[PDB]
Amino acid sequence: MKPKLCRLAKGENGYGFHLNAIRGLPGSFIKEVQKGGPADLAGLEDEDVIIEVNGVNVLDEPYEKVVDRIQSSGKNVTLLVCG
């Protein structure tokens, strides 16, 4: 119900969350926010829906493309989510 805009700096062990999808439901949401990790500190929470990765709307994109986009921006990634 609330949109959050945030910027993650990759840590020793990634951004500190996983993407889950549901099987042909569209959209990608956050799954396993590591306590104290980048995503955690940046305000993200489980079941937050990804709307934009680095300014690009990814709602009409397969879970796999969304994963790729995130793991393709290097040290940083900017996310617009809704939760």
Curated annotation (Swiss-Prot):
The modification Phosphothreonine is found at residue 78. It comes from the Eukaryota. Expression is limited to epithelial cells. Expressed in the kidney (brush border of proximal tubule), pancreas, liver, and small intestine. Expressed at a lower level in the adrenal cortex, testis and stomach. Overexpressed in breast, renal and lung carcinomas. It is found in: Membrane; Cell membrane. Residues 5-83 form the PDZ domain. The PDZ 2 and 3 domains seem to be involved in the interaction with SLC26A3. Belongs to the NHER family. A scaffold protein that connects plasma membrane proteins and regulatory components, regulating their surface expression in epithelial cells apical domains. May be involved in the coordination of a diverse range of regulatory processes for ion transport and second messenger cascades. In complex with NHERF1, may cluster proteins that are functionally dependent in a mutual fashion and modulate the trafficking and the activity of the associated membrane proteins. May play a role in the cellular mechanisms associated with multidrug resistance through its interaction with ABCC2 and PDZK1IP1. Interacts with PDZK1IP1 and ABCC2. Interacts (via PDZ domains 1 and 3) with SCARB1 (C-terminal domain). Forms a heterodimeric complex with NHERF1. Interacts with AKAP2, BCR, CFTR, SLC22A12, SLC22A4, SLC22A5, NHERF2 and SLC17A1. Component of a complex, composed of PDZK1, SYNGAP1, KLHL17 and NMDA receptors. Interacts (via PDZ1 domain) directly with KLHL17; the interaction is important for integrity of actin cytoskeleton structures in neurons. Interacts (via the first PDZ domain) with PTGIR (via non-isoprenylated C-terminus). This is Na(+)/H(+) exchange regulatory cofactor NHE-RF3. It comes from Homo sapiens. The lineage of its organism: Eukaryota, Metazoa, Chordata, Craniata, Vertebrata. The gene is PDZK1. The chain holds residues 375 to 456 of 519 of the full protein.
